[PDB]
Amino acid sequence: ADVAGTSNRDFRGREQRLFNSEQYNYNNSLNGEVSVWVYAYYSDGSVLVINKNSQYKVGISETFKALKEYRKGQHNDSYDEYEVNQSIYYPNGGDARKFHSNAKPRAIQIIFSPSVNVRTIKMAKGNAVSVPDEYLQRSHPWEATGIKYRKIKRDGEIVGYSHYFELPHEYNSISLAVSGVHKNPSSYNVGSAHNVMDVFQSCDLALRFCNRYWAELELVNHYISPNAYPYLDINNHSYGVALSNRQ
Amino acid sequence: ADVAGTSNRDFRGREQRLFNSEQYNYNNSLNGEVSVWVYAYYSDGSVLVINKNSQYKVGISETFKALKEYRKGQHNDSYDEYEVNQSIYYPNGGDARKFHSNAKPRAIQIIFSPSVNVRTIKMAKGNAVSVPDEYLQRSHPWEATGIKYRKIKRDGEIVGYSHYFELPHEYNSISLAVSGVHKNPSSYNVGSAHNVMDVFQSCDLALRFCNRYWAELELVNHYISPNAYPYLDINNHSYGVALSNRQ
Amino acid sequence: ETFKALKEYRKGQHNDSYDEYEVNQSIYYPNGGDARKFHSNAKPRAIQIIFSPSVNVRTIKM
Amino acid sequence: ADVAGTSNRDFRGREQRLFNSEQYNYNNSLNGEVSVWVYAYYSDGSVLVINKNSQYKVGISETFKALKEYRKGQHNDSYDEYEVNQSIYYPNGGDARKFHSNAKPRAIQIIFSPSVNVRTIKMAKGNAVSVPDEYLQRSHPWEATGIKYRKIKRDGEIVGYSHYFELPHEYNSISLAVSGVHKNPSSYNVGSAHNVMDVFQSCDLALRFCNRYWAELELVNHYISPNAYPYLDINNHSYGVALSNRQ
Numbered sequence: 001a002d003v004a005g006t007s008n009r010d011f012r013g014r015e016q017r018l019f020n021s022e023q024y025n026y027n028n029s030l031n032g033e034v035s036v037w038v039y040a041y042y043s044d045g046s047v048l049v050i051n052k053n054s055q056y057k058v059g060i061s062e063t064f065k066a067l068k069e070y071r072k073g074q075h076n077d078s079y080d081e082y083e084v085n086q087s088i089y090y091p092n093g094g095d096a097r098k099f100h101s102n103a104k105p106r107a108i109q110i111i112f113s114p115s116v117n118v119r120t121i122k123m124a125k126g127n128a129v130s131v132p133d134e135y136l137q138r139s140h141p142w143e144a145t146g147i148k149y150r151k152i153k154r155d156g157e158i159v160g161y162s163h164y165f166e167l168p169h170e171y172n173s174i175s176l177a178v179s180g181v182h183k184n185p186s187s188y189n190v191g192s193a194h195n196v197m198d199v200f201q202s203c204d205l206a207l208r209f210c211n212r213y214w215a216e217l218e219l220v221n222h223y224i225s226p227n228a229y230p231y232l233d234i235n236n237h238s239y240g241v242a243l244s245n246r247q
Numbered sequence: 248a249d250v251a252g253t254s255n256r257d258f259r260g261r262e263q264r265l266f267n268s269e270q271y272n273y274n275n276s277l278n279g280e281v282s283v284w285v286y287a288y289y290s291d292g293s294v295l296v297i298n299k300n301s302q303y304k305v306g307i308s309e310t311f312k313a314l315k316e317y318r319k320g321q322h323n324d325s326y327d328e329y330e331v332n333q334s335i336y337y338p339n340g341g342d343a344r345k346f347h348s349n350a351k352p353r354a355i356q357i358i359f360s361p362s363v364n365v366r367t368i369k370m371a372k373g374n375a376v377s378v379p380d381e382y383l384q385r386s387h388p389w390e391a392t393g394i395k396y397r398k399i400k401r402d403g404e405i406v407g408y409s410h411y412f413e414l415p416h417e418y419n420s421i422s423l424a425v426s427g428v429h430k431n432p433s434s435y436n437v438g439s440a441h442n443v444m445d446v447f448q449s450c451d452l453a454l455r456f457c458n459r460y461w462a463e464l465e466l467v468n469h470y471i472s473p474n475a476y477p478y479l480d481i482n483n484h485s486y487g488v489a490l491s492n493r494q
Numbered sequence: 495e496t497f498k499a500l501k502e503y504r505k506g507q508h509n510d511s512y513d514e515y516e517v518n519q520s521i522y523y524p525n526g527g528d529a530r531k532f533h534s535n536a537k538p539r540a541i542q543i544i545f546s547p548s549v550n551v552r553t554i555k556m
Numbered sequence: 557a558d559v560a561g562t563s564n565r566d567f568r569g570r571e572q573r574l575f576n577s578e579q580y581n582y583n584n585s586l587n588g589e590v591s592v593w594v595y596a597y598y599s600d601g602s603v604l605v606i607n608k609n610s611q612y613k614v615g616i617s618e619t620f621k622a623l624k625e626y627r628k629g630q631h632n633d634s635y636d637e638y639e640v641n642q643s644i645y646y647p648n649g650g651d652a653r654k655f656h657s658n659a660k661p662r663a664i665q666i667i668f669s670p671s672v673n674v675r676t677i678k679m680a681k682g683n684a685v686s687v688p689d690e691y692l693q694r695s696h697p698w699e700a701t702g703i704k705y706r707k708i709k710r711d712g713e714i715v716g717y718s719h720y721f722e723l724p725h726e727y728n729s730i731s732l733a734v735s736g737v738h739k740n741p742s743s744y745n746v747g748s749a750h751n752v753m754d755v756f757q758s759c760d761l762a763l764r765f766c767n768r769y770w771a772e773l774e775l776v777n778h779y780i781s782p783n784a785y786p787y788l789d790i791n792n793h794s795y796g797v798a799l800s801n802r803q
């Protein structure tokens with residue numbers, strides 16, 4: 001046989017490159033996943049991730065309360081935190097024993113898979129009582145925020161998209177939903193009558209994951225990296241695996 | 248009057264047969280329910296059922312964590328079980344005090360009502376971090392598993408469909424979503440423009456039920472049987488009520 | 495060892511100690527107890543008996 | 557065939573009688589069990605049974621403390637009861653908050669199986685510090701109490717032997733060991749050199765049982781009766797199953 005790495009008959013090499021390219025491109029086919037992640041960062045360094053993975057479209061929607069830090073199996077000031085919520089829902093509405101709940105997110109990062117079409121991204125960033133823009137009557141139910149998404153790149157390939165906003169002020173008390181649609185460069189509408197029931201089934205088949213990791217280090221090591229997910233850390237370092245035409 | 252059970256003028260008998268046939272056939276009309284049940288069996292003999300009942304289509308989606316046994320009002324090693332989850336999400340990722348959580352399901356049974364079309368059944372059986380097939384990039388978001396569904400029969404009538412798989416190995420750690428579409432032998436597409444908003448409303452109107460029963464006996468006696476639901480027990484015994492052309 | 499002594503006991507952790515009294519009553523006589531579980535996960539799933547190579551196997555009794 | 561219950565060819569009847577006679581006589585063979593039960597009766601009506609079943613010989617030995625009522629999974633005044641014990645071991649030796657512990661047995665019944673030889677029965681009924689007769693130096697380590705054992709009879713057959721003594725006074729604070737030897741009408745000594753190691757093995761093979769039942773009713777119903785054990789209740793009623801030459 002020919003010697004490795006020296007000729008056009010390195011079939012092991014050709015197959016390796018195809019294996020990777022096939023994965024990149026499968027993800028972008030209409031048969032592929034589109035995935036969204038919401039990372040809620042807490043002052044103690046821990047991070048709640050909520051991930052949803054589905055065909056065609058995908059999204060996450062959380063209440064103010066659901067985005068607050070919850071330490072499984074530990075004390076959470078659960079009564080005081082009911083009282084905190086009452087004062088967040090209406091000023092001077094509760095009887096809490098703290099000015100600022102350290103369970104409130106300090107920041108949110110939203111990441112989409114590279115199979116999303118960024119122009120389809122929509123965000124409903126509501127107030128603490130789940131209203132998008134001050135009052136329902138004048139609320140558009142979303143903002144199209146794709147222009148703000150940065151490309152997470154590795155080796156020159158787009159491995160994901162990130163929108164990050166800090167919530168560092170006392171008044172940054174939010175509810176949050178986000179949504180993106182899978183790339184579809186074709187003129188086959190996946191929600192036209194021929195395939196619409198499959199999109200309805202995709203709503204039932206969407207897989208959800210949620211967990212609080214103790215530190216960004218741990219998220220990078222045990223959540224992002226093992227699963228070949230895209231990420232951007234606090235030091236603006238990009239994580240992910242470039243696959244297209246790559247060995 | 249004619250004597251009962253002796254002539255074609257037993258109207259009480261005719262009405263009884265129609266009453267039953269009407270129910271079988273109503274369920275199969277597009278006005279009818281389609282229902283799915285996920286049974287998660289635990290080593291202590293208890294069983295979590297999640298049921299969803301809706302028009303047109305129906306499905307259930309649960310995280311790894313949500314399928315774990317939770318004993319309401321009793322101790323659940325809640326801190327250790329956070330640690331268990333960390334080691335299930337990534338090997339050697341947690342600091343638990345047990346090798347195997349007895350809260351992990353030992354088996355799953357998926358049952359559909361007889362109004363499902365088995366060829367529409369789709370399952371997303373993911374890993375513990377809610378990925379269908381090892382990595383998102385190469386994951387088809389579902390498998391069409393209808394061929395594996397057994398018919399639950401009573402008196403010769405199909406009263407439901409069952410797919411059962413055990414999770415007896417240490418590595419059987421799953422997330423799970425399943426979906427089926429209601430029978431529609433017509434060429435009226437329920438999700439075409441004339442009726443699509445009704446299917447969107449059906450997503451909001453789907454009724455959910457979940458509860459942990461202490462034993463299969465108790466599930467059969469107090470969940471399955473009172474509600475005329477189909478079931479298949481560990482001894483391969485079929486439960487349900489035959490209705491078509493029956494008194 | 496008794497039935498009870500072979501059951502799992504987690505030193506320094508919770509063991510459903512009251513419910514497990516009730517489990518034992520139903521194991522000693524069917525329908526004899528008032529437990530909140532069908533199967534106690536504290537029951538052994540298997541037993542291995544090992545002897546040293548200095549045993550005479552023909553003397554083994556169980 | 558001959559008609560049942562009318563002739564000497566009722567083989568079903570002959571076999572039934574042999575089946576029963578074989579059990580009575582097997583128990584009395586040297587291959588058979590000898591069994592002892594100690595019942596400790598508490599003021600709340602509950603009863604601790606300790607049973608031991610072995611070949612050749614059998615016995616039970618318990619400390620003062622081990623004979624005290626212990627309610628599994630409930631509160632037992634465990635600290636105060638340490639203090640009670642200190643005052644029982646030496647007068648005015650402890651700092652308890654009660655004059656009389658209701659955990660002290662009110663009575664003891666000792667029962668042997670009908671395979672015991674009553675003349676071999678020996679009892680060490682010690683004081684609270686496990687001394688048989690006031691001081692070790694002058695203590696015989698047992699008393700041969702067989703003469704006091706009453707026969708528990710059913711249908712004229714000896715189904716067991718009972719010695720019962722109440723402990724109704726404040727000073728009845730005891731330690732207790734009892735022992736009996738299996739019938740051996742032969743001149744083959746089971747502890748002579750030919751079989752002595754088998755008796756040593758019988759010491760390891762003796763099976764023990766202990767449990768606190770809530771009432772004498774419950775002991776009769778769920779302990780004594782299901783297992784064909786002999787008993788004598790507070791109303792002097794005999795329980796057991798006659799087997800010799802019986803259908």
Ligand SMILES: Nc1nc2c(ncn2[C@@H]2O[C@H](COP(=O)(O)OP(=O)(O)OP(=O)(O)O)[C@@H](O)[C@H]2O)c(=O)[nH]1
Pocket residue numbers: 166167168169171172
């Ligand atoms: N400035 C301000 N914003 C409020 C207040 N209450 C709610 N908000 C919301 O805060 C959102 C903007 O959040 P931020 O960007 O963290 O506040 P900012 O004033 O821009 O401060 P910087 O981002 O740090 O420059 C707006 O969309 C408002 O709807 C308030 O009392 N003052």
Ligand SMILES: Nc1nc2c(ncn2[C@@H]2O[C@H](COP(=O)(O)OP(=O)(O)OP(=O)(O)O)[C@@H](O)[C@H]2O)c(=O)[nH]1
Pocket residue numbers: 413414415416418419
């Ligand atoms: N065999 C194996 N399967 C794994 C492992 N990790 C995850 N799995 C998943 O296990 C799934 C199959 O589960 P099982 O059917 O219970 O395993 P099995 O090897 O077929 O064992 P049996 O079903 O009892 O014959 C596969 O789809 C794998 O994706 C692993 O380390 N070994």
Ligand SMILES: Nc1nc2c(ncn2[C@@H]2O[C@H](COP(=O)(O)OP(=O)(O)OP(=O)(O)O)[C@@H](O)[C@H]2O)c(=O)[nH]1
Pocket residue numbers: 722723724725727728
């Ligand atoms: N009488 C008496 N017996 C004691 C005392 N201390 C220990 N004992 C033991 O109590 C045992 C006898 O118990 P009982 O039969 O309940 O006492 P009793 O005086 O015979 O009273 P009755 O049996 O009700 O007639 C004796 O063997 C003594 O060793 C004590 O202070 N007085």
Ligand SMILES: Nc1ncnc2c1ncn2[C@@H]1O[C@H](COP(=O)(O)OP(=O)(O)OP(=O)(O)O)[C@@H](O)[C@H]1O
Pocket residue numbers: 114151156157158
């Ligand atoms: N919508 C898209 N989805 C996936 N890949 C894309 C998309 N658009 C361009 N690419 C490819 O991704 C790689 C990077 O292109 P891109 O335009 O992001 O890089 P750039 O010009 O260096 O940076 P930027 O546009 O962010 O300033 C190229 O191979 C490009 O063909």
Ligand SMILES: Nc1ncnc2c1ncn2[C@@H]1O[C@H](COP(=O)(O)OP(=O)(O)OP(=O)(O)O)[C@@H](O)[C@H]1O
Pocket residue numbers: 361398403404405
């Ligand atoms: N998709 C269906 N939905 C409901 N009923 C059906 C369907 N297909 C067939 N039936 C009816 O159900 C009854 C049983 O038919 P079926 O083919 O399941 O039984 P079978 O041939 O004895 O068993 P099997 O096909 O499982 O080997 C018949 O009345 C049949 O007409």
Ligand SMILES: Nc1ncnc2c1ncn2[C@@H]1O[C@H](COP(=O)(O)OP(=O)(O)OP(=O)(O)O)[C@@H](O)[C@H]1O
Pocket residue numbers: 670707712713714
């Ligand atoms: N040591 C023994 N073991 C077993 N059975 C015996 C023993 N001695 C006698 N028996 C038998 O038990 C039955 C009852 O005999 P037993 O002498 O106990 O009754 P009794 O004379 O009516 O009453 P008691 O001797 O208690 O005043 C008879 O069949 C007798 O042969």
Ligand SMILES: Nc1ccn([C@@H]2O[C@H](COP(=O)(O)OP(=O)(O)OP(=O)(O)O)[C@@H](O)[C@H]2O)c(=O)n1
Pocket residue numbers: 074075076077078079080081083095096097
């Ligand atoms: N504004 C507040 C806050 C707390 N408490 C009291 O604080 C007690 C315990 O604190 P809690 O808020 O419940 O937190 P933890 O018990 O410490 O932690 P967790 O409840 O999450 O286990 C509660 O009984 C509650 O009555 C109160 O009276 N008023």
Ligand SMILES: Nc1ccn([C@@H]2O[C@H](COP(=O)(O)OP(=O)(O)OP(=O)(O)O)[C@@H](O)[C@H]2O)c(=O)n1
Pocket residue numbers: 073321322323324325326327328330342343344508
């Ligand atoms: N790997 C572990 C597991 C448990 N614990 C400690 O175990 C204590 C109590 O056990 P827990 O896991 O919380 O279970 P339970 O309290 O018995 O039951 P539950 O919390 O569900 O009421 C907790 O305070 C926790 O700190 C720990 O330190 N490390």
Ligand SMILES: Nc1ccn([C@@H]2O[C@H](COP(=O)(O)OP(=O)(O)OP(=O)(O)O)[C@@H](O)[C@H]2O)c(=O)n1
Pocket residue numbers: 322507508509510511512513514516528529530629
């Ligand atoms: N069949 C049962 C089982 C439990 N309980 C109640 O459950 C409470 C606490 O559960 P327990 O069985 O005692 O287990 P744990 O306290 O969680 O753990 P452990 O007692 O071993 O520390 C007890 O007070 C008991 O009264 C009950 O009433 N009936």
Ligand SMILES: Nc1ccn([C@@H]2O[C@H](COP(=O)(O)OP(=O)(O)OP(=O)(O)O)[C@@H](O)[C@H]2O)c(=O)n1
Pocket residue numbers: 630631632633634635636637639651652653
């Ligand atoms: N003579 C005594 C008796 C009891 N106590 C105190 O009583 C408290 C609780 O009573 P306890 O004797 O321990 O019984 P319970 O806790 O009610 O039941 P248990 O310990 O068996 O669970 C203990 O902390 C112990 O310090 C004491 O100081 N002095």
Ligand SMILES: [Cl-]
Pocket residue numbers: 029030031
């Ligand atoms: Cl495609």
Ligand SMILES: [Cl-]
Pocket residue numbers: 276277278
């Ligand atoms: Cl219809």
Ligand SMILES: [Cl-]
Pocket residue numbers: 585586587
């Ligand atoms: Cl013999």
Ligand SMILES: [Mg+2]
Pocket residue numbers: 073324325326
């Ligand atoms: Mg706890």
Ligand SMILES: [Mg+2]
Pocket residue numbers: 077078079
């Ligand atoms: Mg609290």
Ligand SMILES: [Mg+2]
Pocket residue numbers: 510511512629
């Ligand atoms: Mg307890």
